[PDB]
C-alpha positions as MATLAB code, in Angstrom:
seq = 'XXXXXXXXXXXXXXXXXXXXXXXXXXXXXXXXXXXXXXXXXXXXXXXXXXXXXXXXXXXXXXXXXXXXXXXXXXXXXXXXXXXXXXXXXXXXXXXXXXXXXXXXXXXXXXXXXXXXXXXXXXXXXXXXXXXXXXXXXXXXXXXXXXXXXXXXXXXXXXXXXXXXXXXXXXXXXXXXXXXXXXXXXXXXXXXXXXXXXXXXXXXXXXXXXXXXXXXXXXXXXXXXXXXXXXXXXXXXXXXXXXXXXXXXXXXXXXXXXXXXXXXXXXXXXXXXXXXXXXXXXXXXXXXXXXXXXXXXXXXX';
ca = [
       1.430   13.721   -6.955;
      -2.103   12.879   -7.437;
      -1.781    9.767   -9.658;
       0.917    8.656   -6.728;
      -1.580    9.320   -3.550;
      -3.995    7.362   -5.163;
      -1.658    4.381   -5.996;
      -1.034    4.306   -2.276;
      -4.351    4.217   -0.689;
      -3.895    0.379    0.918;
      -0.550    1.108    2.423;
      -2.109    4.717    3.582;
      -4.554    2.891    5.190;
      -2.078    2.040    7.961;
       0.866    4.161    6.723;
       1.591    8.029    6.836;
      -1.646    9.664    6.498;
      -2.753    6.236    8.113;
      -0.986    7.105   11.256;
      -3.040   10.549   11.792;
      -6.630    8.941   12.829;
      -4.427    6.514   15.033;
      -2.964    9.924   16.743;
      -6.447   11.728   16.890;
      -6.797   12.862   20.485;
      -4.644   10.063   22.106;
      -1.369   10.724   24.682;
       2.001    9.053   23.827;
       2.124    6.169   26.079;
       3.000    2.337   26.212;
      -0.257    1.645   24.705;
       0.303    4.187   22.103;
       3.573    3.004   20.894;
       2.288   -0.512   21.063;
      -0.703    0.295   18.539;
       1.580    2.430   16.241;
       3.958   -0.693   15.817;
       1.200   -2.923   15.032;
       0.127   -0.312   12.026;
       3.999   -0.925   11.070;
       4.175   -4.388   10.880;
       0.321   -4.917    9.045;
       2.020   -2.857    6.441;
       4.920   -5.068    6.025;
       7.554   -2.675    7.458;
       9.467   -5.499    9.219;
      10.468   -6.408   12.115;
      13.333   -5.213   12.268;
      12.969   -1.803   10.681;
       9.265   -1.457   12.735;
      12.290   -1.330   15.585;
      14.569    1.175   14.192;
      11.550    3.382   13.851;
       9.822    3.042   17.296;
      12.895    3.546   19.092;
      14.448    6.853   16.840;
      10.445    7.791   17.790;
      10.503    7.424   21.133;
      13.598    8.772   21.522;
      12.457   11.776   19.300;
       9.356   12.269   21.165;
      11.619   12.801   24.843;
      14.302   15.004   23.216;
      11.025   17.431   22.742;
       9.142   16.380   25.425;
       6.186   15.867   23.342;
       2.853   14.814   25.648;
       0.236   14.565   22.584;
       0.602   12.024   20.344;
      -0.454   14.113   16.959;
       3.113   15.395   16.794;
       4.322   11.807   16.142;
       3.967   12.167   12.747;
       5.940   14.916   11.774;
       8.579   13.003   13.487;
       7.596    9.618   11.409;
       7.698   12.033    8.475;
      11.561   12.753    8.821;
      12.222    9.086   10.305;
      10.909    7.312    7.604;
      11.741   10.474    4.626;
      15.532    9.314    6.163;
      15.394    5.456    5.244;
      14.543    6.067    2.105;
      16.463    9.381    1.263;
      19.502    6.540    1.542;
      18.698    4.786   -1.235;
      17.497    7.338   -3.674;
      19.995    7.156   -6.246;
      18.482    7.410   -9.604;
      19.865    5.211  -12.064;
      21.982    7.064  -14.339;
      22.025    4.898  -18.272;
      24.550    7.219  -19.772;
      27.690    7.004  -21.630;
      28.395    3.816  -22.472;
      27.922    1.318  -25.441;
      25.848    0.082  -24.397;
      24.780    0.311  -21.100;
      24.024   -2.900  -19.444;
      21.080   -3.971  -17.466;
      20.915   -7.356  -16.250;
      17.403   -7.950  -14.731;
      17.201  -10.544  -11.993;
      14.152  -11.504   -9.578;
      11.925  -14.654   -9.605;
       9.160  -15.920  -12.295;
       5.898  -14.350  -11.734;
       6.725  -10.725  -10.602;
       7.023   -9.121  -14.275;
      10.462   -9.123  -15.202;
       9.502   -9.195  -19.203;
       6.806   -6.444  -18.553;
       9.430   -4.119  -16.565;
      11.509   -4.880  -19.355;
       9.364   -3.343  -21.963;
       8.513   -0.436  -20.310;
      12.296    0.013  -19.026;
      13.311   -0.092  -23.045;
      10.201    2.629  -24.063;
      10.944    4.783  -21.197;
      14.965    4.635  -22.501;
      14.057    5.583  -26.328;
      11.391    8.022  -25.141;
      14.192    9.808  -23.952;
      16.502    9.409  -27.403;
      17.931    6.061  -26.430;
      18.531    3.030  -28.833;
      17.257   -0.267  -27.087;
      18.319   -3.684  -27.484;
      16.917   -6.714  -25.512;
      18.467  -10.175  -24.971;
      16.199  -13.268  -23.901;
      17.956  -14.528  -21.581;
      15.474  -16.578  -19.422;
      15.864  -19.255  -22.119;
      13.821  -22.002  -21.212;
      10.646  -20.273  -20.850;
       9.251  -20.349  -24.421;
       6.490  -17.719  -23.476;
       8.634  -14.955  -22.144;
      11.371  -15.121  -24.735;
       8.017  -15.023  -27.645;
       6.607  -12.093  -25.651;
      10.151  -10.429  -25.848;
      10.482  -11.241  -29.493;
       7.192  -10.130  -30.618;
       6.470   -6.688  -28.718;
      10.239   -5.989  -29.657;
       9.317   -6.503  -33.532;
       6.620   -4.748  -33.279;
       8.296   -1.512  -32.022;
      11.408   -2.049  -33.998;
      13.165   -2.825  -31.173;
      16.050   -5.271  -31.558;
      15.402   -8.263  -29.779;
      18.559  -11.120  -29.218;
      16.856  -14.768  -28.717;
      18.116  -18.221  -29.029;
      16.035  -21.600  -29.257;
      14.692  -22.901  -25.986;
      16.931  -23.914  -23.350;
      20.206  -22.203  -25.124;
      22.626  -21.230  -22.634;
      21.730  -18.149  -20.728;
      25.352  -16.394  -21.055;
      26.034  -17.621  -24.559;
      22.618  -15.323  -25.451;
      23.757  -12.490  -23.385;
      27.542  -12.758  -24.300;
      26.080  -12.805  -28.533;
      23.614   -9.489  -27.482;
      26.440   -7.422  -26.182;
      27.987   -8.614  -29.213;
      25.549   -7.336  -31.116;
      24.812   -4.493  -29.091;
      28.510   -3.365  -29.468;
      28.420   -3.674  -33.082;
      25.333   -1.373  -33.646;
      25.958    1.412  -31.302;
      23.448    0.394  -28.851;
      22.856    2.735  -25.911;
      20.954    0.280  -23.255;
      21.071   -3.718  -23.649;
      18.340   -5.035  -21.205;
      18.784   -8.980  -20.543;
      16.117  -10.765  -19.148;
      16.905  -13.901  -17.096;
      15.790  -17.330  -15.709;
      13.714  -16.807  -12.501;
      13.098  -20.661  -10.886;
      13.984  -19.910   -7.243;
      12.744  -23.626   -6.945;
      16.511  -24.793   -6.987;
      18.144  -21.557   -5.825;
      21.842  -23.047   -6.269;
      21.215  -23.602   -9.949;
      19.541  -20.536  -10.536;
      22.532  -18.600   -8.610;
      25.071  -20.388  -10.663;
      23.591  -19.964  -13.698;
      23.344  -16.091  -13.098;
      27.234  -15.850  -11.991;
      28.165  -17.249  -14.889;
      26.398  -14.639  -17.172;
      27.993  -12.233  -14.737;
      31.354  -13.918  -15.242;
      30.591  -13.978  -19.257;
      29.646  -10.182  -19.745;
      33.742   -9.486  -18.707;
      34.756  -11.205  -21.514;
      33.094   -8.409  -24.247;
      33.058   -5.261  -21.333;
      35.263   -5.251  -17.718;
      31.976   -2.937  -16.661;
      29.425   -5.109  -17.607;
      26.536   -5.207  -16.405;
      26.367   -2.115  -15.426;
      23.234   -2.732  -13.286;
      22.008   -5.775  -11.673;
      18.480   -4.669  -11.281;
      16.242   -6.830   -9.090;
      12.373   -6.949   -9.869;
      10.374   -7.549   -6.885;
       6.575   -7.350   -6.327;
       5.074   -5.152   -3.152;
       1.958   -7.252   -3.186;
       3.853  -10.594   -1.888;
       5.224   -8.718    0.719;
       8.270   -9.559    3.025;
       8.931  -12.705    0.342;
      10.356   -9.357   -1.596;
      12.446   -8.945    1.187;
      13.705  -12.846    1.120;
      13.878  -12.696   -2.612;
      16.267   -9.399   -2.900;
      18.230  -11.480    0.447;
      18.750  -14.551   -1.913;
      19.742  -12.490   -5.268;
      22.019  -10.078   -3.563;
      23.777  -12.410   -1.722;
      24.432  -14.381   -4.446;
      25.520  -12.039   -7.194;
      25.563   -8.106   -6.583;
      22.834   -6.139   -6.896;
      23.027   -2.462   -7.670;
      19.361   -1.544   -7.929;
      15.880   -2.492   -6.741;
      12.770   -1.995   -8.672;
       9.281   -2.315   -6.800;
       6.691   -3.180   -8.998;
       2.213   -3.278   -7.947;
       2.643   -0.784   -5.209;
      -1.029   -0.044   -6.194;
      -3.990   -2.024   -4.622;
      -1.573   -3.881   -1.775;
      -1.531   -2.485    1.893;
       1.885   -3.933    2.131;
       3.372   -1.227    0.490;
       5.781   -0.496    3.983;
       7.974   -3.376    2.312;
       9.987   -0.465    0.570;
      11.099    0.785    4.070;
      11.742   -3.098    4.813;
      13.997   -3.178    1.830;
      15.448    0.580    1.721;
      16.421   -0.172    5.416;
      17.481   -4.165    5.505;
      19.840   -3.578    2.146;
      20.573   -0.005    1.256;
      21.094   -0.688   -2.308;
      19.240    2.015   -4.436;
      15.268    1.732   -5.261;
      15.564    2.838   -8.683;
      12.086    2.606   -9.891;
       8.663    1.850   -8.519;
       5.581    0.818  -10.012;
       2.614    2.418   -9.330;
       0.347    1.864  -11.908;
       0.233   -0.023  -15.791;
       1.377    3.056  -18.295;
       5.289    2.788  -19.534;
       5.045    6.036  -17.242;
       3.814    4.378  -13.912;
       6.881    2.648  -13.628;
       8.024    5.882  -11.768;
      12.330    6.567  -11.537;
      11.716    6.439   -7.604;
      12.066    9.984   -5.924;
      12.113    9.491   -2.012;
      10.411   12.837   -1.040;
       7.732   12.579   -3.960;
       6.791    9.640   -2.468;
       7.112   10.641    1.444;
       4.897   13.484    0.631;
       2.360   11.241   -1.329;
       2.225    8.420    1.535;
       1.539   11.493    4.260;
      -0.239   14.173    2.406;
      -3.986   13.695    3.693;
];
């Protein structure tokens, strides 16, 4: 995974093949383990996970009686290969009519975007698409919705500004229902300003959906950007605890060393990392395979 090892090059910095110039030469000692953490938490691992990992280390390290530290990172290998291989679950799209995707996460971390290469990705593989504004008081992302989808003759359900968020979603599955759509994607507001009306508002389009489809959505997928590190972490903490969320995407992996966030969040929440972005094609926004991208973050 070429295109992947290069996406990673900040986070490797400090991270998996980061971790083998650290080892070079040294013994496993206080020091050692003291150094190794602070690699951990530059990258954004957390706290708490930067923990987890140390100690199933250290204890690792005794159970073989390792004395050089170079063997450390087979051990971090399987360690952190483990966190993630919990929450590896691809997201499955199938069988229903359609198949709903509500996409939560704050302004500013490319909801729309993920969106629109969600819905190519979907009819690339023989899917029919259909999108619903839903973040309806921001003129610019429900026009950016409405003209991409027009252009590739992709349904697109929109109401004037500041129509009510469920109402929109409630008349797509409508729609969606009526046409045989496979996947409905809703987009939705994202002012985490006043996180009690934003929460509200997104329970009620939860509490809407049931109405048209007891299943729906079928996916509350959060967006949340690697680059502004452990505010991802807050972020998917304030949306899941709020409403349910069933799947994680993690979007501008590329360029940011703080790409150890996805062992923050794989760890903190266990709810399933379904895609991850590591570059700007429709195909960069990768369905998230934990050993594809273990062996990319420690191949040298």
């Amino acid at each position: 995974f070429a295109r992947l090892k290069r996406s990673l090059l900040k986070t490797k910095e400090n991270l998996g093949s980061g971790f083998i110039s650290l080892f070079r030469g040294k013994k496993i000692d206080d020091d050692l383990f003291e150094e190794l953490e602070e690699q951990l938490l530059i990258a954004d691992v957390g706290v708490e996970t930067t923990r987890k990992i140390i100690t199933n280390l250290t204890e690792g390290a005794s159970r073989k009686q390792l004395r050089d530290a170079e063997a450390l990172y087979g051990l971090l290998k399987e360690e952190m290969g483990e966190i993630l291989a919990k929450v590896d679950e691809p997201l499955n799209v199938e069988g229903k009519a359609p198949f709903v995707i509500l996409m939560v996460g704050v302004n500013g971390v490319g909801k729309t975007t993920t969106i629109g290469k969600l819905a190519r990705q979907f009819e690339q593989q023989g899917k029919s698409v259909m999108l619903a504004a839903g973040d309806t008081f921001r003129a610019a992302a429900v026009e950016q919705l409405q003209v991409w989808g027009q252009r590739n003759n992709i349904p697109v359900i929109a109401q004037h500004t500041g129509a009510d968020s469920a109402s929109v979603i409630f008349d797509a599955i409508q729609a969606a229902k009526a046409r045989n759509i496979d996947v409905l994607i809703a987009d939705t507001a994202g002012r985490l300003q006043n996180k009690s009306h934003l929460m509200e508002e997104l329970k009620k389009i939860v509490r809407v959906m049931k109405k048209l489809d007891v299943e729906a959505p079928h996916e509350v997928m959060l967006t949340i950007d690697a680059s502004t590190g452990q505010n991802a972490v807050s972020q998917a903490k304030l949306f899941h605890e709020a409403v349910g969320l069933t799947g994680i995407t993690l979007t501008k992996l590329d360029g940011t060393a703080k790409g150890g966030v996805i062992f923050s969040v794989a760890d903190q929440f266990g709810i399933p990392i379904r895609y991850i972005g590591v570059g700007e094609r429709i195909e960069d926004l990768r369905p998230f395979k934990a050993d594809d991208f273990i062996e990319a973050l420690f191949a040298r």
